[PDB]
Amino acid sequence: YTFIDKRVIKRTTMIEGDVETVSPLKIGGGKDNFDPSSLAKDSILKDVEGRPIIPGSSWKGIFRSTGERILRLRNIEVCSGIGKDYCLNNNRKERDFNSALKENVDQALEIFWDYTCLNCKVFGTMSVIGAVRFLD
RNA sequence: AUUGAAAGUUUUUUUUUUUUUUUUUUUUUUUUUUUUUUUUUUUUUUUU
Predict the structure, then answer these.
(1) So where does this one cross the membrane (predicted)?
(2) Radius of gyration for the alpha carbons in chain A, expressed in angstroms and rounded
């Protein structure tokens, strides 16, 4: 039950890798302004020094969608982790979880372990922080 | 119409002076404005 409990960090895993673009890459820069010395009107997201960084949000979204596809392939039920559609809401256990938050923590942990999916318990869901952090 | 009477118990004198309801006493001790959201989809550098 250490997976959900964030009080104690009993392990720490870190992956540092290099991403090489086999195909051309275009991360949308907002298509609303071209502040730096870009090339086309639809500028990609870049640092003030011109460095075209990749947002951590994009990594998180890509990983979440790929995991959704993988779990759907493995016939494993999974939340959508977006909008008003997470299996906390789908299972109608949100009110009980909110009550348990003020109440004994063990009940909240049991609820979040039994009535919860994997993607929105790993990447995180509403009012719960995910276990994994994505950097830029 | 008394043995038979006609006299203010009155004048005069400030219950006044000395003395700060005063000294000491911090409306503070605790609480991360975080939390789930891919700037995405559509478009053949192209003809008489």
Answers:
(1) none
(2) 19
